[PDB]
Symmetry: D4
Subunit: 235 residues, 8 copies
């Protein structure tokens, strides 16, 4: 019942809002020497790990327009819920990004940690990089959220927050490691700096997409009906 | 004779060209932890110290549209030589900035070390900061280039390259420490990023100006004729 | 029957049209000393109080894209009627704003009383302010339009026009007190001055929204079915 | 000697700087009811009256690119001094306008009291109005600064600050009463709002001009040589 | 059957195409003295009169996004057919306008007879004028296309082409007499001159609309069910 | 003496001002049938014929930046006087164009009779046309203003106003017949419609130029020294 | 089943991707003398011939938003499949165009073989040309894909790849021979050069459209029901 | 005498005009296979060779703002004559480019043979390339125009037209081989395509400059006074 749909939508609004707030608010590279990298990288992972322990208990804790797209291709969600989530994540983001702005001194709140391709990196490589970052990440979630799979994986939250962290350990250097359009979106709107911005929807969309592909049919397929299950779209 | 005017103009073209090249090419903050600050800061000082040991022996080694302006108000140069120098420094800069570009890998040659005001800093403070940076700097040159003054100052080049370095030790954080329009100019032209750029002419112009003022009349005045000397403009 | 839907839509077109016309046409701050504030503030309240005595008898007299949104989240209207109303209010506004323009001398019809954030106020505070203005206002309407509640409230029209007036007594200083997108919209279109304009949809949308929330579930909830009632959307 | 030229230029820089600062800083219409009009109007007059008691003792205290133009046509100044003054007034203005900005809270420092034509007023009337404002004003200065004229005029400063004040008592309603390009210039540059801005150079330029005309030849002519005196331009 | 829907759509594409072609191609005011007015005015009427004798026999011969809107409010058409017609008229227009362009020498095919508000006329009057032009015109069609009405009206085509002509006899002076968005559209697209262009959709839309109103309910109402007939929208 | 230079400059300001005012104010094609052509064409001629009877008695009555250029190449004027005239004609124009604007109802004062190339005419032909128009015109003035030539030419004013008129009888159709940049300038500035505007400086500049050429050396040369006379530039 | 819909969509993504890649990657006119024409012309034909032998075995191998539109009017597809194909071809294109970019040296990958109208050709002729190119091409596919027709046509792939080739043999000179919006689209997006770009959707859309017309009803009609078959749209 | 200055200026106007006309009008690459290269390359050389046989007999036949700059640094011309030439070459160019336009069918007169950097070439290399092209070219002219040098060089015209041709044989591939700003200028103005245009002033300016350097002092110096000769600037 709606007491579920609208909860999940809010859990997705709050879960994304905090994600941006904490993640982004740690990324304000206030610390040059000790690579912000291990810092912001685990920040984003723990942030996600907590939100999944917390929210993944109600909505799924996608907090990522890429993952929500990845479950949609995945013939797991409804295009409705799948669009409610993206608007709730985008609103979450921007909101968590507004708050961070209101709480952090100017001198720190620069560009709000806006994802920006690395200097010599160009957009195609950038886009390549964001593809692999979302793919490994979307592949990790599909595999931890996948019931049939079980035994001893421990914690989905870590099993998934470390995926996000590995994403950044690598991709903060190539693209700042957005791998979440919401997250690239939010500070693109508040700073009005939409430069090389599309790299961040395409890259993770295609990544997410050809990640739910590389799992659902390629790696760990489905043992009943594929055409029958696609009826979830119609409801 | 012109064999002097045109030398000085070239010495100013080369002396500025290298200045940008070395200075800027060190500033490419390839090193986060060990503050680029002590690095790029002494880079700019040594760069200047060498150019002054080298070129200050022929033209004066201003390599700075602010200093050339400071000597002009200073009723020391001709508005001609004073304009030849600025166009030779701007051309020097851009040229030394073109070369650096051609020699440094993309991944390193980001924005070419473009002077950009610090995040929470606004333009007026920025402008304030650039004023004090050029003032202390233009004051140090006036006082080391000032013959009547003597005894034991040691080396003008250091006596002046440390001034530039103190400028950066402070002002790389507020404004990136341009304190040389040429230097802010050159990468503004190659990257086509003229944002908050005027802060860098005003700030150092006014600094230079009210620096040749704070010395020539205020601190260490002139003991003959002030109105008579101003005849240098007419030649 | 449509003889109701289309009436309400017109009542909403006229009711909004007059609202803008009277409200806005009083706000033309022709009177500096005696704060336009008590003036335009009661103007907007009486205007609303009359339109509600008048029109609230047929459509609801929302004359405010924020209130119409607030009843929609409120699971009280149909997304259809809810969109018919907003287009009828926007058309009402602009029309009532066109007329005012045609009747008032230039020297008076300046910017048509365009909502503009106060000088030192920034957009986030502005947005904050518009949130609280629509919240208290949308909360007052929900509570006066709420049947179960009764006894001795007197007049909904006043019980609601004073809410609008309190909105302005406060918010004309922070944001000009739009708290009605229609009202900010109309003179934004005729003067082509859409500056800081979004502050006026967001601010009151979120206000209206988290106002129908703070009442419907928080303060004075519903005693039957929440998931069942949401079937009104489907008709 | 330059000890005079450069003094006057500074006296004109400071005298204009304060003028903008005080004038403009009073005009921040912090007081609606009691017409800012008598307030800002005498502010600008006293400001001028003081600057003339003060500076008119050294440079002339034009603090107005219109008056400096008016003395130039007036075949009283050199095109050099006449251009030094305008750049010193424009720099004065902007500087006095920067300071005001740094000292006054946002909530007060709105548009910095930017001259803006009145609503129904159009640009030609506006331009007409600024013409008459500078004409009466430039006529009053010519007549108080005019030696041959004497007897009992009392104080030039008042004899001239009341002229400025009468200018505003009238023209703050039509154009905000710039009648000083410097003064319209300065907040046009800091707020980057050059709307209907030219109205403020033309209007007062033509006013000043056909004001030094209406006096020098029309009303109170010259009794020696007109063609001979014009040799002042050549020095 | 579609053999009707798609015919009408083509009849509307051709019928509009010729309308623009002939109408517009006569309006190329190649004749100053003999007012183009009687000329282009009857051109547009005959053009319409012929297209209605011709096409009004199959689709209705609206050849006017305003009339098609007028029948839609009129609860006579389907929103589908009503949108098919407008896209077929817009395509008709542009096509008939392309052809005219390809057949008429440059020296003649100026702006393609683009509707442009008259000089001193402003947009609101313009919009007023286009309202009355479409109203009288949409009122004439409703009344000639209205079966219950009969007896001796003679020819609908004239009974309707004279309406168009009276529209122009009047409105070519105020607005060029578009009274057909298609017709204002087509040369707005080929000449890329969309100036005061909206005046031509609004004006005739509102005219058409409050014209099908002034007839359907006001003047010559309906004697069965109004709410029941509105079921045509659903098919 | 200046009592001559400054007179001529004013005579050129007024003489141009009226020219635009009368000429342009007749050209407001209030009369379609009776070609505005004979009308505006003689208007411009008489206007010129009067201004030359009137002003050509003091300054030369060029009232045309093209003719003033034509006398300059003509080694007849000083580059100073030649620039004073153009700024006085441009100011004259705009002023005479402002006045016309203030005196003529909107409905008449459309685009202020802005010169605009004819529809099928392109810019090169246009430019060609304006060349021949200024050439025949500049040739007629050179030949009527040329003393050595005499006998029985009657009236220079007609001998020159008919030249202007023949210019228009022809060129109002190709280019509106500017053949006076001042005249194309003035309504280009007030209406802010600088379209195909350069056609009007080039075309008449080159015309004027290669017109003072086709006369001074080609047709009716000079019988003393050509290199010696060019000393007029130096004074 | 979807195992068909989604295959076809991919076959259309890959089939278009290669088409652009091979076609476009041959068209990089690396060879001036030997007309690129026979080269790129057969390249595009073989490319298509192979993709049809290959993919036309599963989806139809439209690889052309024009052909997919042509089958849609053709009442052969569903508007859904018809839109899935165009987004899959556009994505195919851009992707095949991205790859080509990543594999071909700069010096070769100029504008990516962007369709651009020929110099003296204008847009209407261009549009005319693209119409005939898509018409003959869409007519050839309709006739080879048309079962009832049979006997001895040999190979559809050639029977269709030669059609594409004849298209280019002709139209590379007039328009570069896009005749495939996907193909004009892809390098318009990567080079950001959308000049005269619409010529390439219109031209081939209208061509395709009035090509499925010239066959389905005109030349080789249908012998059962036309209105009944149109039920495919509803599924 | 001027009978020389003004001749040379015209000879430079015509000599440049034809140069553009013939050169450019041959370059209209109407012939793909037989490299336009040998064609346009000798076209530009012969064009120059003829203009030098023809005009180099009066003005020098620079027909190149780069060469005129090269003689200026060369302390051979006056900054006056040196600026007269550039404006006469730019006017020559554009004029010869206008004519070509008026004589050549559209289908041929594409972009007017606009210099455009080669695809993979970037601007710095481009600029590098244009430097070497003007250097070898400016070096060849200095050495053929250099009297002291003699004996048996044959024809300066060839001795110089082959230099231009070698310039193109090489540089039409890298930059289209402008090596004449006039020549890049002229079609940049008529086609309004100023893309990568500065590459063509810088590149050849610096080339010309450091070419008159590499000869005058480096390779074949001067045996009298260098400071004394520079007095030519003062006349
Ligand atoms: C299905 C996908 C599976 C994923 C697996 C594929 C991953 C590999 C993709 C790598 C991206 C290639 C782009 C690149 O690293 O270099 C492109 C090229 C660089 O020059 P060059 O190496 O060709 O030769 C010059 C050699 N020399 C420097 C020694 C002289 O040109 C330039 O402008 C510089 C780069 C500008 C961006 C171009 C992006 C191309 C789009 C990627 C293709 C993906 C298709 C969707
Ligand atoms: C769920 C919501 C419940 C509603 C209850 C919350 C109401 C409170 C919200 C207040 C808005 C905060 C914005 C503000 O008043 O000041 C932001 C900050 C000012 O500097 P500072 O105070 O941080 O420190 C400098 C201190 N010193 C001046 C002494 C040196 O930066 C600036 O640029 C100036 C302001 C520019 C606009 C920034 C808006 C932030 C977005 C609001 C957050 C709402 C999330 C949707
Ligand atoms: C239902 C369709 C069936 C297809 C069969 C029709 C195929 C024929 C269409 C031909 C296109 C006509 C455009 C054209 O070749 O020349 C247009 C015109 C050229 O001047 P002129 O020949 O009229 O007279 C000047 C004569 N003199 C040069 C000797 C002085 O004007 C200009 O600006 C130059 C051309 C600029 C583009 C204009 C395109 C017009 C739109 C085409 C119509 C299609 C309707 C959808």
């Amino acid at each position: 019942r709606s007491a579920s749909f609208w909860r999940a939508i809010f859990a997705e609004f709050f879960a994304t809002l905090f994600y941006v707030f904490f993640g982004l608010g740690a990324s304000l590279r206030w610390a040059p020497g000790p690579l912000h990298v291990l810092q912001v990288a685990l920040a984003f992972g723990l942030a996600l790990a907590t939100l999944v322990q917390a929210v993944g208990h109600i909505s799924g804790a996608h907090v990522n327009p890429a993952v929500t797209f990845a479950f949609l291709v995945g013939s797991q969600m409804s295009l409705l819920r799948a669009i409610c989530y993206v608007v709730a994540q985008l609103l979450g983001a921007v909101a968590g990004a507004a708050v961070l702005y209101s709480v952090t001194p100017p001198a720190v709140r620069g560009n709000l940690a806006l994802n920006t391709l690395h200097p010599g990196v160009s957009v195609g490589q950038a886009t390549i990089v964001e593809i692999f970052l979302t793919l490994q990440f979307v592949l990790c979630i599909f595999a931890t959220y996948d019931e049939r799979r079980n035994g001893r994986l421990g914690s989905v939250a870590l099993a998934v927050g470390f995926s996000l962290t590995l994403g950044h350990l690598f991709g903060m250097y190539y693209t700042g490691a957005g791998m979440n359009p919401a997250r690239s979106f939010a500070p693109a709107i508040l700073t009005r700096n939409f430069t090389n911005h599309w790299v961040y929807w395409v890259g993770p969309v295609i990544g997410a997409g050809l990640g739910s592909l590389l799992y659902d049919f390629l790696l760990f397929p489905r043992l009943k009906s594929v055409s029958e299950r696609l009826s979830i779209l119609k409801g």
